C-alpha cells in the first residue's frame, strides 16, 4: 500500500514514541505501522548549518526522517510570524497579535526549505498529512516543486471566523495555502464552517453537492474530525498510578479535603487569573468550603518571555489568594510548575472531585478528556468546561461556563462539588458514550480513509 | 395624517443644529419628527437627586420634547457599567478589554426598564417608535413587558459582532431576545445584519421566511442594514464658506506649503491611533523626501468621560507623537501636530478641503462619518485622497478609498505615500466613484428608508387586523 507521510513540528524520539508519552506519535503511529510509512519534521537539536538532507532512521517499519534547525530557521519557525500574528488571531486573542512583513517572508521562507527538504524521499503515491498552523504553507511549498501527491492538512488550533481571520492581514494567502491541500481538516464542525464561510463569502469559491469546495482551481475536501482518546487505557492508567509517590503525597497532604485539578500551558489562551479568581470567588460566596476543599494547578514548563510573564503572574496572584484564606494544615491554591508523566496526571484526575478547565479559547482541549476517562465511575469527577473549547461540543455532561463570567466559574465549581452522586453518574456516563464513540483511531481512520479516496478518485 | 414618530435617544439636545450640513442624530430625524409632529424622548443632559416623576414636555413648533433628568446611580448604570464596560468593546471586537459584572448587568435592564415605563404613559396606540443604538437594546422588550403594541423599530449605530464574538458577552443569548422584541432591527452594514442572522439561524432560535423577514421568539422581525450617509453638497458648500476663516488661513500659513494629512478621531480603543501614528513614522523612514514636505494633524476631541481610558490613550498617544516628533523635526517642522481640542464643525470641514489625504484606518467601526464627510469637502477640481480601515462600515461604499488594513502598518505606509503622490486624474475617478454613492444613499435615504419600514409594519397589522369588506 501507499506509504503514509506525517509532517509534524517534532519528530518523536525515544522514550517520547511510548504510547504513555502521548501526543501526535499515538495519534499516528498505528498509520505509520500500517502503511510502513515516514514520519518528516526536526529532531529538536540547534545545527550550525542547514543539514544537507534528513537524517533516517528505521525502527522496524517506520522510518524518522529528522532535520535540525539553524538559529535563524528556529527563530522563522517558532519566534515568528506563527507565534506573534497566527496563534493569537486564532485564538481570538488578536489584541496581542503583531504582524511583521519580514517575519511573514520567513514564515515562507522556512515551509520551502523544509518542503524541499521531504521533496526528494517522496514515491508519488505516498500520502502526506501535515499538522498544525506552523506547517499551514506545507502543500503549496510542495505544489511549486511540482509535487502531486494527496495532501491532507490537519488544524489542531480553531480556525476563526471571517471578521477575526481578517486580522491577521495574508489572510487570503492563507486560505489559498489551505486550498492547496487536497483535505483541510479541522478540530470542530464550527472551525470547518468558517473556513466555508470565508470562501463561499468573499466569493472565492462554492460548495458542490457532494461537499466539496472548489476554490483556487483546486477541488478540497473540508471536513471536521474532533480529536479524542484511549477512554479505556486512560482509565487504566489512573488506576495503575494511584500508589505512586506523587499521588500519594498529595493525597496525604490533602487529609480527605476535596480536590480540584487544573493543567494547563501558560499562554494568554488560558485565562488561568480567571481560573484563580473564580476559585477565590467561590471561597467568598461559601466560606463553608475554606479549608474543606483545593485547586491544585499545573503548568508544564515551556516564548521564554511570556511564560516568565505569566509563571509570575500566577505565582503572585496564588501567593495572594493564599494569604487571604490559608488555614493550618491547608493550601487554597497549589500552583506547581513541574511536568508530571501523563499516567500520573490522570491518577490525580482520578482522585480529584472536579476538573477546572476553562482556558479562554481551545481547539479541542485533551485534558478535558483525559480528566472524564480517569474516573472512577463508582464515585465519578465533574468536568466545569469553557464553552470556547472544541471540547464543549462533544462534552455534553460538563457544566458549561463562559469565562469571561467569572461568577458563572465560581458557581459551576461550588455546584460540582455539591453534586450528587446520582448526577455525577448520569453526568460521567454520558460524557463517556461520547469518548467511546469518538475515540483517537476515529480521527486517525477518517482522515487517512479521505487521504486514500483522493489516491482513488485521482486514478 | 400620519402617525407620530417617536424618537428615543441618549440625549435630547435643546435646539441643536438640523441644517443639512451640521451632524449629530438630530439633523438625521428630524425631518421625520417635524413631518409626523412626533416627540424625542430621552435624556435632558441633567442629573437630578431623585428619579424624575414625569417626563418635562416642551414644544418646538410641530416638535415635542419629553425628557427626564437621571440620578446619579440612574447615570452611572446607563453609562459607566454594562453598556461600556461590556458591550461596546465586544461589538468593537475588543473581547480582551470586556469587564462582564452582573450586578452592572441587572442595572442596565434597571434602568431600561424605567425609562421604558416613563415613555409607556406619553404613547397613543398608532404611534411609530424609533430606538436608538446600544444603550436602549433592552427598551422594546420593556415595553412589551408593559404591554406596548405599537411598531417598535431599533437601529444600532455600532458594528454587530458575528456570533463567535458576540458570545464573549455572557448574555449574549438574552440580548438577542431583547432584539426580537423588535418589529424592525436595522444595522449599518449587511455584514452586521448577517451577523445577527447568523446567530438566529444557526443557533436554532428563529428562521428565515421566504420574504427574507426572521421569525424568532414568537416574533416576526424585518432585519436590515440602513447605512448612515450625510449631506454630501451641504458638506461641500459649509466647507468652501468657511475657507476665509482665521484659523483656516492660520494652518495653511503653518504649512507653508506643506501637504497636509487629516485625521479627526475621539480617544477610544476602537480607533487605533498608535497604527495611525506609527505608519505615518514609517513611511517618512521609508520615503525620507517626504520629511519636511507633509504633516499630519491628529485632532481628538476630548471626552473626558471615561477618565481612565481617556487618559490613558492621550498619555500613550503623546509619548507616540513626542517620540516620532523628536525622530523627524526640523527648525521649521513638526511632522505630527496631535491637538486635544474641539473645532466647529465647519472648520473641520474646511481643514479637510485644504488636506490632500485624509486618514482613517480605525480598527472597527460600525460606520464612521469622518471618512464620508471627509469625501464630501473636497474640491473636485482638486480632491483629495481618502485612505480608510476595511473594518469600517464605510468601507463598503466608499470603494474609491484606498483601503488597508490598520493591523499592517508598512501597508498604511504605503497607502499614505500612494496617497501624497496620486496623479490628479486617479485621485479624481476615485473622488467621483466615492461622491457618487454619498450622493445615492445619503441622510434621507437612511430616514426615508427606516420609517417606511416602521410603516409597512403598522400597515400589515392593519391588515390582518380585518378580514371584512371595505370602501
Ligand atoms: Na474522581
Ligand atoms: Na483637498
Redesign the pocket.
Known amino acids: 500500500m501507499s506509504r503514509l507521510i506525517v509532517v509534524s513540528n517534532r519528530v518523536a524520539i525515544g522514550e517520547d514514541t511510548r504510547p504513555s508519552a502521548g501526543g501526535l506519535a499515538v495519534g499516528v503511529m498505528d498509520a505509520l505501522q500500517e502503511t510502513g510509512g515516514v514520519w518528516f519534521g526536526w529532531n529538536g537539536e540547534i545545527v550550525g548549518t542547514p543539514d544537507a538532507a534528513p537524517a533516517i532512521r528505521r525502527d522496524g517499519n517506520v522510518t524518522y526522517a529528522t532535520v535540525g534547525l539553524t538559529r535563524r530557521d528556529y527563530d522563522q519557525y517558532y519566534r515568528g510570524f506563527s507565534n506573534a500574528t497566527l496563534w493569537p488571531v486564532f485564538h481570538y486573542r488578536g489584541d496581542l497579535a503583531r504582524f511583521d512583513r519580514q517575519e511573514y517572508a520567513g514564515y515562507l521562507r522556512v515551509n520551502a526549505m523544509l518542503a524541499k527538504q521531504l521533496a526528494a524521499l517522496l514515491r508519488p503515491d505516498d500520502l502526506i498529512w501535515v499538522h498544525d498552523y506552523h506547517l499551514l504553507p506545507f502543500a503549496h511549498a510542495l505544489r511549486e516543486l511540482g509535487v502531486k501527491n494527496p495532501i491532507g492538512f490537519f488544524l489542531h488550533i480553531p480556525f476563526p471566523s471571517p471578521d477575526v481571520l481578517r486580522l491577521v492581514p495574508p489572510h487570503d494567502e492563507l486560505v489559498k495555502f489551505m486550498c492547496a491541500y487536497d483535505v483541510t481538516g479541522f478540530q470542530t464542525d464550527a472551525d470547518r464552517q468558517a473556513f466555508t464561510d470565508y470562501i463561499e463569502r468573499r466569493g472565492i469559491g462554492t460548495a458542490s453537492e457532494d461537499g466539496m469546495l472548489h476554490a483556487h482551481g483546486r477541488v478540497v475536501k473540508v471536513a471536521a474530525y474532533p480529536i479524542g482518546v484511549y477512554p479505556d487505557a486512560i482509565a487504566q492508567a489512573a488506576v495503575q498510578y494511584g500508589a505512586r509517590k506523587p499521588v500519594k503525597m498529595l493525597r496525604d497532604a490533602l487529609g480527605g479535603r476535596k480536590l480540584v485539578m487544573s493543567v494547563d500551558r501558560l499562554d494568554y489562551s488560558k485565562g488561568l487569573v480567571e481560573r484563580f479568581q473564580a476559585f477565590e470567588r467561590m471561597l467568598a460566596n461559601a466560606p463553608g468550603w475554606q479549608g474543606r476543599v483545593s485547586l491544585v494547578q499545573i503548568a508544564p514548563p515551556t516564548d521564554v518571555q511570556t511564560y516568565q510573564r505569566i509563571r509570575e503572574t500566577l505565582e503572585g496572584e496564588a501567593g495572594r489568594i493564599n494569604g487571604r484564606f490559608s488555614q493550618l494544615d491547608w493550601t487554597p491554591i497549589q500552583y506547581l510548575n513541574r511536568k508530571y508523566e501523563r499516567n500520573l496526571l490522570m491518577a490525580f484526575?482520578?482522585?480529584?472531585?472536579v476538573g477546572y478547565v476553562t482556558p479562554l479559547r481551545d481547539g479541542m482541549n485533551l485534558v478535558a478528556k483525559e480528566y472524564v476517562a480517569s474516573?472512577?465511575p463508582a464515585?465519578?469527577?465533574v468536568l466545569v468546561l469553557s464553552e470556547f473549547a472544541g471540547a464543549a461540543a462533544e462534552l455534553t455532561g460538563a457544566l458549561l461556563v463562559n469565562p469571561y463570567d467569572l461568577s458563572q466559574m465560581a458557581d459551576a465549581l461550588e455546584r460540582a462539588l455539591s453534586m450528587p452522586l446520582a448526577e455525577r453518574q448520569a453526568r460521567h456516563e454520558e460524557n463517556l458514550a461520547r469518548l467511546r464513540a469518538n475515540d483517537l483511531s476515529v480521527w486517525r481512520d477518517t482522515f487517512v480513509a479521505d487521504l486514500r479516496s483522493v489516491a482513488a478518485a485521482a486514478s
Do not use: K, T
Open positions: 484526575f482520578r482522585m480529584s472531585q474516573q472512577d464515585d465519578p469527577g
